[PDB]
């Protein structure tokens, strides 16, 4: 079926409003950025707060958050269900 985590072009502040209401750590969504057209953002809840990450793209067209590169957003999301998205906190993605 369709992915549960793709929310299209929603404002940053609306993504924080929606995620704040979730109760589990790791609840997340991918959105199309309004400040940087053509880029995607990953918004995730952890520890009563919401953090935003930019999905980076390199010179081969691959997507990544830090070092490990992926050929699709779907592969980057599923890798981060079991490897943290943060370097200082353990934040594993969980669908809303």
């Amino acid at each position: 079926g369709s992915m549960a985590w793709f929310f299209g072009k929603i404002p940053r502040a609306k993504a924080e409003e929606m995620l704040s209401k979730q109760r589990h750590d790791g609840a997340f969504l991918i959105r199309e950025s309004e400040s940087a057209p053509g880029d995607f953002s990953l918004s995730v809840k952890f520890g009563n707060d919401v953090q935003h990450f930019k999905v980076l793209r390199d010179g081969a067209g691959k997507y990544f958050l830090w070092v490990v590169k992926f050929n699709s957003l779907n592969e980057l999301v599923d890798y981060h269900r079991s490897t943290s998205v943060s370097r200082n906190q353990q934040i594993f993605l969980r669908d809303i």
Binding site: H52, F53, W66
Partner: peptide
């Protein structure tokens, strides 16, 4: 441009 955890300012 706002900030992102993985984009160092």
């Amino acid at each position: 441009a706002p900030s992102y955890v993985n984009v160092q300012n």
